[PDB]
Structure formats: structure tokens, C-alpha cells
Amino acid sequence: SVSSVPTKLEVVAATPTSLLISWDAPAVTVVHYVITYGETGGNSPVQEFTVPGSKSTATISGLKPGVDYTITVYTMYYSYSDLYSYSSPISINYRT
Amino acid sequence: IKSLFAVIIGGSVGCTLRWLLSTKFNSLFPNLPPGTLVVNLLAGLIIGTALAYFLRQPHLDPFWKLMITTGLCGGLSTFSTFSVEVFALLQAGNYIWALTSVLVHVIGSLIMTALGFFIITIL
Numbered sequence A: 001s002v003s004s005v006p007t008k009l010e011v012v013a014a015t016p017t018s019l020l021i022s023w024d025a026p027a028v029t030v031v032h033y034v035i036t037y038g039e040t041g042g043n044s045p046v047q048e049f050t051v052p053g054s055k056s057t058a059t060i061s062g063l064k065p066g067v068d069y070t071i072t073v074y075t076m077y078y079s080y081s082d083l084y085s086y087s088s089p090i091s092i093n094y095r096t
Numbered sequence B: 001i002k003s004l005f006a007v008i009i010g011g012s013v014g015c016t017l018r019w020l021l022s023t024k025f026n027s028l029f030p031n032l033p034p035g036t037l038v039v040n041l042l043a044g045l046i047i048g049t050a051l052a053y054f055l056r057q058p059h060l061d062p063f064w065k066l067m068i069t070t071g072l073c074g075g076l077s078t079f080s081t082f083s084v085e086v087f088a089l090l091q092a093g094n095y096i097w098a099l100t101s102v103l104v105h106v107i108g109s110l111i112m113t114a115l116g117f118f119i120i121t122i123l
Ligand SMILES: CCCCCCCCCCO[C@@H]1O[C@H](CO)[C@@H](O[C@H]2O[C@H](CO)[C@@H](O)[C@H](O)[C@H]2O)[C@H](O)[C@H]1O
Pocket: A052, A053, B087, B090, B091, B092, B093, B094
């Protein structure tokens, strides 16, 4: 009934080696967000970290300059029917 | 046992009502899920009216009393869904709404029990 996926994922600020991203929270109790990032340009390992549910921004560091990254966010959220479960992801591309 | 049937029939009706109201309405306001709140408030109201009504009608078959209280009100209300909702809010860092949920469920349910009792007592 209610989407648990964040919306309007975007890069709000950037340096050659880092990205400040933000999104709009979904209308559910988010316990934490999981942020993934990896080079868009072949088999290169995707990395992940968590951000608390009250935050709707995150910094990604230690990137390489001039490289395309695929960045995704999904939620670990509480709901009545599923208790703690994971949403689908929202995804963007950004070139440092 | 006849008593067991009262518990199961009343319980099953209450549990079913809670399930329907919770699935339909909880996601409308996730900071204080209103389906879980409404069934606790309603069970509070019914047990209040039962409190007053059974006092004035002492020869009511223990079957109907057991079906209404242990069965319906017991199946309808929940402390466990209430708790996990609060626990989730606490894990999400949402302290203000965790506290608010506890106050609204507890103070609210006591008020409904009082209303149910005093409405019937004032008839
Ligand atoms: C009177 C009440 C009865 C007792 C029951 C208490 C309930 C249990 C505590 C809730 O669980 C913790 O909540 C933290 C607070 O939300 C979470 O921290 C998360 O969120 C914090 C808030 O920013 C971050 O600082 C942490 O690093 C991050 O792990 C943490 O993971 C989680 O295990």
C-alpha cells in the first residue's frame, strides 16, 4: 500500500573523491538506510554502509576522480505486516 | 470445556478485527499507527462498559462475560504490537514519538475505560 523506497535520490555536493547525497524519506518507520556504491564501468566491487533512520543524507568518500559511480539507497524499515524487512532500491549514476 | 469455546470464539473475533483494522489503517500514520491505537482504545471502552454493566447484572452467565472480556477485548487489544512499534521507533532514533505513543496508548486506554464505566453508571 505505502512505498518503503526513498525518492529523489541525488548528489547535492561533490569533490573529486567524495559525494554528498540526499533523498526524501519514505512514509514508513525507517530503522536505517543502506547506501551502496560502485564503479558503473565493469565488475568492480560494490561497497555498502548504513546510515541511521533519522538521517536523509550521507557522505561517500575515498572515490577515484573522473570515474562513473552507480549509487543506490534502500531501507530497513518497520511495518505492521512484515515487521523488519528491506525495501527495493532507488538508483542514480554520477561521474566524479 | 464450554469456557474454552467462549475464549476461542471471542478471541477469534477480536483477533480478526485487530488484523483487519491494523492492516487497513496502520500505514496511514506510521509514527503512531492508528489501527493498533483504535483497537486498544475500543477494547478499553468495551471493558469499561463491561465493568459497570456486569456489576449491575450479577447473574449473567459466566460464558458471556468470558467471551466478552478474556475473548473479545483480550483478542482485540494488544501489548505486543504496541511494544514492537515503540521498539522500532526507539531503534529509528525517534524518541519523541516513542514517548508519545506510550502516553497516548496508556492514558488513552484508561480514559476510554473510565468513559465506558461512567457512561453506563450514569444510565
Ligand atoms: C525505557 C525503554 C525500555 C528499554 C528498551 C530500549 C530499546 C533498545 C534501544 C534501541 O536500540 C538502539 O537504538 C539506537 C538509537 O536509535 C540505535 O542506534 C542507531 O542510531 C543512533 C542514532 O543516531 C546512532 O548514533 C547509532 O550509531 C545507530 O546504531 C541502535 O542501533 C539500536 O540498537
